[PDB]
Amino acid sequence: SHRKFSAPRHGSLGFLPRKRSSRHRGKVKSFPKDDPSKPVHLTAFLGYKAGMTHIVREVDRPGSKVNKKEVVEAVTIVETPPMVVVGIVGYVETPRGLRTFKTVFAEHISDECKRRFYKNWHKSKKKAFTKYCKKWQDDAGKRQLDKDFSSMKKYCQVIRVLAHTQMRLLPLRQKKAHLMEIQVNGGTVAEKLDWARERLEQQVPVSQVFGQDEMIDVIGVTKGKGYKGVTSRWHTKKLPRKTHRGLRKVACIGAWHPARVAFSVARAGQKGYHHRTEINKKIYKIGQGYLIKDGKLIKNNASTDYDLSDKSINPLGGFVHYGEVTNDFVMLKGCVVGTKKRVLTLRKSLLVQTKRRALEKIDLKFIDTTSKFGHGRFQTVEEKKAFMGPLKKD
Amino acid sequence: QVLVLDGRGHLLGRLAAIVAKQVLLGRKVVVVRCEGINISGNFYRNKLKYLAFLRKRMNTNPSRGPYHFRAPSRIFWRTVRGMLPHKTKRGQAALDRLKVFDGIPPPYDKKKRMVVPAALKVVRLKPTRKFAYLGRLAHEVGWKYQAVTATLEEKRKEKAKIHYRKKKQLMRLRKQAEKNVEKKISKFTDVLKTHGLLV
Amino acid sequence: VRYSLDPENPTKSCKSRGSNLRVHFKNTRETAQAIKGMHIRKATKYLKDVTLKKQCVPFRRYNGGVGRCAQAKQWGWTQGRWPKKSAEFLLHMLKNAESNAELKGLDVDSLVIEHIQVNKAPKMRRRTYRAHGRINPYMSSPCHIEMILTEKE
RNA sequence: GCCACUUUUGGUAAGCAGAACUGGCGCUGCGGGAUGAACCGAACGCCGGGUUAAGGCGCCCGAUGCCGACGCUCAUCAGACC
RNA sequence: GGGUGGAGCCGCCGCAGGUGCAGAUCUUGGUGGUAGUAGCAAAUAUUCAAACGAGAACUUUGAAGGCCGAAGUGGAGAAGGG
RNA sequence: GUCCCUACCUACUAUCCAGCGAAACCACAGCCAAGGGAACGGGCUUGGCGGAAUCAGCGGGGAAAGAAGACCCUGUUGAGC
RNA sequence: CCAAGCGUUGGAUUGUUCACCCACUAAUAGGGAACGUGAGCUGGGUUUAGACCGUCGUGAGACAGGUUAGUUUUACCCUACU
RNA sequence: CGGCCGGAAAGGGGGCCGCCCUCUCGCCCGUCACGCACCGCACGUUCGUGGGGAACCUGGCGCUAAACCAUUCGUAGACGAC
Ligand SMILES: [Mg+2]
Ligand SMILES: [Mg+2]
Ligand SMILES: [Mg+2]
Ligand SMILES: [Mg+2]
Ligand SMILES: [Mg+2]
Ligand SMILES: [Mg+2]
Ligand SMILES: [Mg+2]
Ligand SMILES: [Mg+2]
Ligand SMILES: [Mg+2]
Ligand SMILES: [Mg+2]
Ligand SMILES: [Mg+2]
Ligand SMILES: [Mg+2]
Ligand SMILES: [Mg+2]
Ligand SMILES: [Mg+2]
Ligand SMILES: [Mg+2]
Ligand SMILES: [Mg+2]
Ligand SMILES: [Mg+2]
Ligand SMILES: [Mg+2]
Ligand SMILES: [Mg+2]
Ligand SMILES: [Mg+2]
Ligand SMILES: [Mg+2]
Ligand SMILES: [Mg+2]
Ligand SMILES: [Mg+2]
Ligand SMILES: [Mg+2]
Ligand SMILES: [Mg+2]
Ligand SMILES: [Mg+2]
Ligand SMILES: [Mg+2]
Ligand SMILES: [Mg+2]
Ligand SMILES: [Mg+2]
Ligand SMILES: [Mg+2]
Ligand SMILES: [Mg+2]
Ligand SMILES: [Mg+2]
Ligand SMILES: [Mg+2]
Ligand SMILES: [Mg+2]
Ligand SMILES: [Mg+2]
Ligand SMILES: [Mg+2]
Ligand SMILES: [Mg+2]
């Protein structure tokens, strides 16, 4: 017979091989389509997830019931140091797809990027690119290099530059940086390679890639949760208490006469650590980093134009399980994918966005930087000791 | 030792029938530019037959199902496999002998392509009937590379046009050479004309 | 006694035999296939690392239900186990064959294990007690180990 | 016991039940009908050569790779062999 | 023919039978795959050092931490065991 | 917390390893759609196709296993009443 | 008409499939997959053995009549899927 | 033998300027004989310095690496894996 009461289907078949993903950092499956009218720009970046925080801002959207009222909103802080460009990759379009043409690296490559080519940096004798880097300081070598830059000018269509993180600035344990091909969308192939090789071997910060108040897409693997049953993975209904062989299951796998079990049946396996791509995350703030001026460091990241405090984006006692965000960062609306200390690929949106919720200007009033290791109730150390007075430690 | 067939103007199964038997006889056949293969009947019936082929699908796990190849070269490869006995070693050896390309790649752009008049749409269709282009059907049904193959074919048509102009002016030099030298090759020419090579 | 294959040179080959060894046949056959080609000192440090769980025995034929380990990727196999008394019985047999090469007057440090063979010994029974008043067998599976070492440079 | 040409009873009908004549299947392979107890051809010692039946001859798959004859037929559900 | 084995065996003419195995959920004996698998999960719990020893998570001694808690995991009987 | 609506913590498992280690079951065995067929195939026909060896689960399918149907009928087979 | 992409509910009564009513709704459409789905569950009903009632039978007992209590066994094999 | 270009869809063993060399030999008709004429007889004639594998080899210009276990981490985790 049929199904007695029709109900919608648990889970989605669009995300169907729910497995541990093969790649740790999330990769970009599609960059935005380039048009030659724009100036050249990187269409992605790469920063690491630090933690979660409030904001307070006044919403100016006409016609809502929250017009000129004052919300709080959950934000995520992605600590985002400037990435170091190391090489450019060209691609020719083929009837079988889009194959790579000629990868050309820089001369000097930082050791934190060199670590990526080694499953064991300890026992290796660190010999990578040593025969290759000699192609820059001899005349026959750089004639060969001008030859294949000229070939990449002639035969390539899309051009994407290798850039790695600068891991020695992060509070993490690891040192082995992350490398990424970021597509240079902008002018022609000539102007594209000109920009790419003149910014070869040097840095590029966040603000040259993203602007403030801009919807981006966040890519990464989720927070892995292990081998888990159908109730905790596929959210099927728990069978009642009286069930003999356990209740946290799916009762009927499939019908008789399709003599298999279909791939659409909700079964127990790996939950979490899946590659995911969420879209339309609004950037509220692109923070300046810690830097030195006139001898003392200037620190006030979490200061707004309505607060003028001296507090930074770091809460009391640092972000829990991450560390202290010192250099540049982006502050995004709501939550993104993955646990703390997680590499988290940012990129541009493929969509054109002419709607006012994507076009809302953002004026922040208060970034609640209290302690996350409990119930924090003080914004900063000076306010805490000025409220509590002298302790016995003094 | 290798047939290079063009694919423009040939009917799908009516070309695959000659190619199947010719490959079972041990030839090596390269059917090139398979986005120019015609199919008889009109375009809407032909894409309805292909969408029916898409709907036919293994229910419990379509990963095991019929792999509907969307590229035109592989649609033609699947129909040659339909005409060959591919479950056995001689049919699989035949499918190893057959190579099929979209567009005309650089191993075979510098060669001369054959045509099969027994499969050719200007012969085996009445001129008022409708036909259907396999490349436009395949793009219509999910092949992604019509535009890049079209631009690459435009490039090779330009470069072959340059080659053809130079071959023309070479053969003009050849006939001016013959008219300059006929007085002293006349005794070599007329012995070919009496044996019917040159009239 | 009567071995399976005689050595191709009896003058520079020592021999060793053991019958009815109370150790499992399936655990012993595959550690014998693990140490089948080795040099003698390499084989002894292999078996002691098997006892200390630093190198595993890839279970290749008697394969079902034994889980995986990471130390078997150096054997090119996903599964492996570390059978310690199965290492120890044929480790005693390596000591016996090394003693026999010493008695015969051979170069000890040139002994490659050429032949090794594990057969099934007669099963010796015990009882187990099942539900509903039944009795099932609880058979042992001892083995016969046979080993031939030969001088090689 | 069962099936089939034709005759025929009951039942709306049945791959249903019940008869008559004859042939089959059972007891029976083989070529054809893709597949198949019964249909078409044909009944069998082991083989070589030739030739056929029924059915076929784009390719699977032997044989139309005839410069086959005369027409009809457009299907956004074509049609294709007791 | 070759190998193994170590004390009896066959051909022909008649005779006589407890005379030929793939099946009987056949009888008896052995052996596989399952399979190094299920499992070795009722009643809170072990740890350090030493001794004997070829060898010690399991024996013994000392110390520590626990339990049975006087209707006991204690001290003795009856039936049964021998 | 029976449920909306499930979530979390603990002990003993299950997991992995050292040692010891069975049984039920088994024609050969195991990928599907349709066709015909003893009128619901793993095998045949026509297609789809097919890549060693394996681990933890799982209960669709093997018209899964046990038990010469107990219901119905036949028996010139019986018994209790 | 093209069209099954996406939905088609919460409850009172009954073991119910059906049925009926309250309420929301956008709509409360119909169905199939061995009348899907018991090594998935439940065991309310039917359908064992105990019992009470009505009718029938002289009686043992019978009831497509009502009522009450009544063991729901195994996966570690192969495939399939995760 | 040196320099110039021509190729990216799966990149052309092509074209060009000279050079010290050497040739009237290469091709077409004729003169001249010679070449195991192996005694009628099969896989002959090639792409063939063919693909793959070993050591014999003689020189020259060049290179002296990672992976896996083990340890650790805990963004991961049944075990592997990450
Ligand atoms: Mg429905
Ligand atoms: Mg129960
Ligand atoms: Mg907190
Ligand atoms: Mg096995
Ligand atoms: Mg198993
Ligand atoms: Mg027991
Ligand atoms: Mg008992
Ligand atoms: Mg009848
Ligand atoms: Mg007969
Ligand atoms: Mg017959
Ligand atoms: Mg038919
Ligand atoms: Mg007939
Ligand atoms: Mg007739
Ligand atoms: Mg004949
Ligand atoms: Mg035919
Ligand atoms: Mg004797
Ligand atoms: Mg007798
Ligand atoms: Mg027998
Ligand atoms: Mg017998
Ligand atoms: Mg176990
Ligand atoms: Mg006592
Ligand atoms: Mg006592
Ligand atoms: Mg298990
Ligand atoms: Mg074990
Ligand atoms: Mg077969
Ligand atoms: Mg089943
Ligand atoms: Mg059963
Ligand atoms: Mg019975
Ligand atoms: Mg019976
Ligand atoms: Mg009778
Ligand atoms: Mg009686
Ligand atoms: Mg209720
Ligand atoms: Mg049912
Ligand atoms: Mg059941
Ligand atoms: Mg079932
Ligand atoms: Mg009941
Ligand atoms: Mg009465």
Coordinates of C-alpha atoms in Angstrom, one line a residue, chain A residues 197-350:
Chain A
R197 CA 54.3 38.6 -11.7
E198 CA 54.9 42.1 -10.3
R199 CA 53.2 41.1 -7.1
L200 CA 55.0 37.7 -7.3
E201 CA 57.1 36.7 -4.2
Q202 CA 55.6 39.5 -2.0
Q203 CA 52.5 39.9 0.3
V204 CA 48.9 40.8 -0.2
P205 CA 46.6 41.7 2.7
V206 CA 42.9 41.2 3.1
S207 CA 41.7 44.7 2.2
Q208 CA 43.1 44.5 -1.4
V209 CA 40.9 41.4 -1.9
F210 CA 37.7 42.0 0.1
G211 CA 36.0 45.2 1.0
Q212 CA 34.0 46.0 4.1
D213 CA 30.2 45.4 3.8
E214 CA 30.4 42.8 1.1
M215 CA 28.7 39.4 0.9
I216 CA 31.1 36.6 0.6
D217 CA 31.0 32.8 0.4
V218 CA 32.7 30.7 3.1
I219 CA 34.1 27.2 2.3
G220 CA 35.4 24.6 4.6
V221 CA 35.0 21.2 6.1
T222 CA 32.5 21.0 9.0
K223 CA 33.3 20.0 12.6
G224 CA 33.7 16.3 12.5
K225 CA 31.5 14.3 14.8
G226 CA 32.4 10.7 14.2
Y227 CA 30.5 7.6 13.2
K228 CA 26.9 8.4 14.2
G229 CA 23.5 6.8 13.9
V230 CA 20.5 7.7 11.8
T231 CA 18.9 9.8 14.6
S232 CA 21.9 12.0 15.2
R233 CA 23.0 12.1 11.5
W234 CA 19.8 12.0 9.4
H235 CA 17.4 13.2 12.2
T236 CA 14.9 10.5 11.6
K237 CA 12.2 10.0 14.2
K238 CA 13.1 7.9 17.3
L239 CA 11.0 4.7 17.4
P240 CA 9.0 4.4 20.6
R241 CA 10.1 3.1 24.0
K242 CA 8.8 -0.4 23.7
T243 CA 11.0 -1.4 20.7
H244 CA 12.9 -4.6 21.2
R245 CA 16.1 -4.2 19.2
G246 CA 16.7 -0.6 20.1
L247 CA 14.9 2.6 19.3
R248 CA 17.3 5.0 17.7
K249 CA 16.9 3.5 14.2
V250 CA 15.0 3.6 11.0
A251 CA 12.3 0.9 11.1
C252 CA 11.7 0.1 7.5
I253 CA 14.8 0.2 5.2
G254 CA 13.0 -0.4 2.0
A255 CA 10.2 -2.2 0.3
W256 CA 10.3 -5.9 -0.6
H257 CA 10.4 -6.0 -4.4
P258 CA 13.0 -3.4 -5.2
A259 CA 15.3 -6.2 -3.9
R260 CA 18.0 -3.9 -2.6
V261 CA 18.2 -0.9 -0.3
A262 CA 18.1 2.4 -2.2
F263 CA 20.8 5.0 -1.8
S264 CA 18.2 7.4 -0.5
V265 CA 17.6 5.4 2.7
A266 CA 18.9 7.1 5.8
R267 CA 21.7 5.0 7.2
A268 CA 24.3 5.2 10.0
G269 CA 27.8 6.4 9.1
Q270 CA 30.2 9.3 9.2
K271 CA 28.7 12.5 10.5
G272 CA 30.6 15.7 10.1
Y273 CA 33.9 16.8 8.5
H274 CA 32.1 17.3 5.2
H275 CA 33.2 19.9 2.7
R276 CA 30.6 22.7 2.6
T277 CA 30.0 26.0 0.9
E278 CA 27.7 28.6 2.5
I279 CA 26.9 31.8 0.6
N280 CA 26.0 35.4 1.5
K281 CA 27.9 35.9 4.7
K282 CA 28.1 39.6 5.3
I283 CA 31.4 41.2 6.4
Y284 CA 30.8 43.7 9.1
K285 CA 34.4 44.6 9.9
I286 CA 37.8 44.2 8.5
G287 CA 40.1 44.8 11.5
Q288 CA 43.5 46.4 11.4
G289 CA 46.2 44.3 13.0
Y290 CA 48.5 44.9 15.9
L291 CA 51.3 47.3 14.8
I292 CA 53.8 49.7 16.4
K293 CA 53.5 53.4 16.2
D294 CA 55.8 55.9 18.1
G295 CA 57.1 53.1 20.3
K296 CA 53.9 51.8 21.8
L297 CA 51.5 49.4 20.1
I298 CA 48.1 50.6 18.9
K299 CA 45.6 47.9 19.8
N300 CA 42.0 49.2 19.7
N301 CA 40.3 46.9 17.2
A302 CA 37.0 46.5 19.0
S303 CA 36.7 50.3 19.4
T304 CA 33.9 51.7 17.3
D305 CA 32.9 55.3 16.6
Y306 CA 30.3 55.1 19.3
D307 CA 32.5 53.5 22.0
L308 CA 36.1 54.9 21.6
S309 CA 37.5 52.4 24.1
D310 CA 41.0 51.0 24.0
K311 CA 40.0 47.3 23.8
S312 CA 40.9 44.9 21.0
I313 CA 38.9 42.1 19.4
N314 CA 40.5 39.6 21.8
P315 CA 38.2 38.8 24.7
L316 CA 39.3 38.3 28.3
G317 CA 41.7 35.4 28.4
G318 CA 41.9 35.1 24.6
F319 CA 39.5 33.1 22.4
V320 CA 38.8 29.8 24.0
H321 CA 40.7 26.9 22.4
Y322 CA 42.2 29.2 19.7
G323 CA 44.6 31.9 21.1
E324 CA 45.0 35.6 20.7
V325 CA 44.1 37.3 17.4
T326 CA 46.8 39.9 16.9
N327 CA 47.0 40.7 13.2
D328 CA 44.3 41.3 10.6
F329 CA 40.8 39.7 10.7
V330 CA 37.4 39.7 9.2
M331 CA 34.2 39.7 11.2
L332 CA 31.3 37.9 9.6
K333 CA 27.6 37.8 10.2
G334 CA 26.5 34.6 12.0
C335 CA 28.3 31.3 12.1
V336 CA 30.5 29.6 9.5
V337 CA 31.7 26.1 9.1
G338 CA 34.2 24.2 11.1
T339 CA 35.7 24.1 14.6
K340 CA 38.1 26.5 16.2
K341 CA 41.6 26.9 14.8
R342 CA 40.2 25.8 11.4
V343 CA 41.4 26.8 8.0
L344 CA 38.5 28.4 6.3
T345 CA 38.5 29.5 2.7
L346 CA 36.9 32.9 1.9
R347 CA 35.8 33.8 -1.6
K348 CA 33.7 36.3 -3.6
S349 CA 30.1 35.7 -4.6
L350 CA 29.2 34.4 -8.0

